[PDB]
Design an enzyme around this catalytic site. Structure first.
Site, PDB file in Angstrom:
ATOM      1  N   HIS A 142     -31.239 -47.751  68.573  1.00 23.20           N
ATOM      2  CA  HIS A 142     -32.579 -47.750  68.225  1.00 23.20           C
ATOM      3  C   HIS A 142     -33.029 -47.619  66.614  1.00 23.20           C
ATOM      4  CE1 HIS A 142     -37.006 -46.045  68.510  1.00 23.20           C
ATOM      5  NE2 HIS A 142     -36.836 -45.712  67.372  1.00 23.20           N
ATOM      6  N   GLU A 143     -32.164 -46.716  66.033  1.00 20.77           N
ATOM      7  CA  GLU A 143     -32.432 -46.701  64.508  1.00 20.77           C
ATOM      8  C   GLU A 143     -31.630 -47.834  63.640  1.00 20.77           C
ATOM      9  OE1 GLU A 143     -34.052 -44.566  62.711  1.00 20.77           O
ATOM     10  OE2 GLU A 143     -34.933 -43.629  64.583  1.00 20.77           O
ATOM     11  N   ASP A 226     -49.241 -39.391  63.863  1.00 18.56           N
ATOM     12  CA  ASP A 226     -47.943 -40.330  64.071  1.00 18.56           C
ATOM     13  C   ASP A 226     -48.069 -41.645  63.544  1.00 18.56           C
ATOM     14  OD1 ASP A 226     -45.242 -41.025  65.230  1.00 18.56           O
ATOM     15  OD2 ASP A 226     -46.283 -41.562  67.075  1.00 18.56           O
ATOM     16  N   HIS A 231     -45.118 -43.943  67.790  1.00 16.56           N
ATOM     17  CA  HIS A 231     -44.295 -43.437  69.131  1.00 16.56           C
ATOM     18  C   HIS A 231     -44.877 -43.507  70.403  1.00 16.56           C
ATOM     19  CE1 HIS A 231     -41.844 -41.927  65.416  1.00 16.56           C
ATOM     20  NE2 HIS A 231     -40.921 -42.339  66.256  1.00 16.56           N
TER      21      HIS A 231
HETATM   22 ZN   LIG Z   1     -37.925 -45.498  65.636  1.00 12.74          ZN
HETATM   23 ZN   LIG Z   2     -36.548 -42.537  64.174  1.00 11.11          ZN
HETATM   24 ZN   LIG Z   3     -38.986 -42.259  65.626  1.00 10.42          ZN
END
Ligand SMILES: [Zn+2]
Ligand SMILES: [Zn+2]
Ligand SMILES: [Zn+2]
Ligand SMILES: [Ca+2]
Ligand SMILES: [Ca+2]
Ligand SMILES: [Ca+2]
Ligand SMILES: [Cl-]
Ligand SMILES: [Cl-]
Ligand SMILES: [Cl-]
Ligand SMILES: [Cl-]
Ligand SMILES: [Zn+2]
Ligand SMILES: [Zn+2]
Ligand SMILES: [Zn+2]
Length: 316
Positions: A142-143, A226, A231
């Protein structure tokens, strides 16, 4: 560092044994010379100074508890590299075989992990909300996929563009998890979230509402928290991606699933050829439709299923 390429063995955060590519020069270092310009894993020693010291081990065996986050950061960076190379012919996150550097034991009790623009950074968790976050291959990928996005479309991290940014990272984090055969699923972070609670996760792509995230555009979050719900509203795109791959009926719209590989080809092409920094959900639909048209033809099942999936989540 200069030295000889070696293969060590260790156990990751969850106690699983795996071989790791190392470099021998007096010590064995977490330096993998077999992938691009290298994969390098560092000990941040509970500080916030980065990157820390290149990880050194006396005997090329990595079975200590303190070793486990480094084993997984190193190995799962390698798996993510292998996925992008073998599936998308993409060499590292920038497509030019940039070195992948990761630091573990970042800070103390830190419930987070992130790509910082130059490297991966992993907290150990506080032991209740998270165990060391490099133990989750979907978190690692993901990152690292945020880096892919930064080097391609440049999606901005606010509002709908930022939710697309998040969903792209969840999609390819999950496709890396399937590519690895690392107990794959369409949940995010299940391997490192809440060690005392089985069967949960940070969010669900197959059923975002399980955790209160929207699964339809009409249920999107419109407030300012956020970064405008990046997210949260990612659930709308994550569900569309799940439907494209696995099929199903969602809000009365039947989607014919086309499988994970075609999902990945369609979204990778959308990301690299068509998305821009400010693409919104409607423009992502258009990009996915065009990408599927490029790959499979305008009259294909694949194009029809992309349209069905975005219809199902209320995105025109
Ligand atoms: Zn992310
Ligand atoms: Zn992240
Ligand atoms: Zn995140
Ligand atoms: Ca050792
Ligand atoms: Ca997962
Ligand atoms: Ca859990
Ligand atoms: Cl469902
Ligand atoms: Cl549902
Ligand atoms: Cl379904
Ligand atoms: Cl439903
Ligand atoms: Zn899993
Ligand atoms: Zn549904
Ligand atoms: Zn469903």
């Amino acid at each position: 560092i200069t030295g000889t390429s070696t293969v060590g063995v260790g156990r990751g955060v969850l106690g699983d044994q795996k071989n790791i590519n190392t470099t021998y020069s007096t010590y064995y270092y977490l330096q993998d010379n077999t992938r691009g310009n290298g994969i390098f894993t560092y000990d941040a020693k509970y500080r916030t100074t980065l990157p820390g010291s290149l990880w050194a081990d006396a005997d090329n065996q990595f079975f200590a508890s303190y070793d486990a986050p480094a084993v997984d950061a190193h190995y799962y960076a390698g798996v993510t590299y292998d996925y992008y190379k073998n599936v998308h012919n993409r060499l590292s996150y920038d497509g030019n075989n940039a070195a992948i550097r990761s630091s573990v034991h970042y800070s103390q009790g830190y419930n987070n992990a992130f790509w910082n623009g130059s490297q991966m950074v992993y907290g150990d968790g506080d032991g209740q909300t998270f165990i060391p976050l490099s133990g989750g291959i979907d978190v690692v990928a993901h990152e690292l996929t945020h880096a892919v996005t930064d080097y391609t479309a440049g999606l901005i991290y606010q509002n709908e563009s930022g939710a697309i940014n998040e969903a792209i990272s969840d999609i390819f984090g999950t496709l890396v998890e399937f590519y690895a055969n690392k107990n794959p699923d369409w949940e995010i972070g299940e391997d490192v979230y809440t060690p005392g609670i089985s069967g949960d996760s940070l969010r669900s792509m197959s059923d975002p509402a399980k955790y209160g995230d929207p699964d339809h555009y009409s249920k999107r979050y419109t407030g300012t928290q956020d970064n405008g719900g990046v997210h949260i509203n990612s659930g709308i795109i994550n569900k569309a991606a799940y439907l494209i791959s696995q099929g199903g009926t969602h809000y009365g719209v039947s989607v014919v699933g086309i499988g994970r590989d075609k999902l990945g080809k369609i979204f990778y092409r959308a990301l690299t050829q068509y998305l821009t920094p400010t693409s919104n959900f409607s423009q992502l639909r258009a990009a996915a439709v065009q990408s599927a048209t490029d790959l499979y033809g305008s009259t294909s099942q694949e194009v029809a299923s992309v349209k069905q999936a975005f219809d199902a989540v209320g995105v025109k």
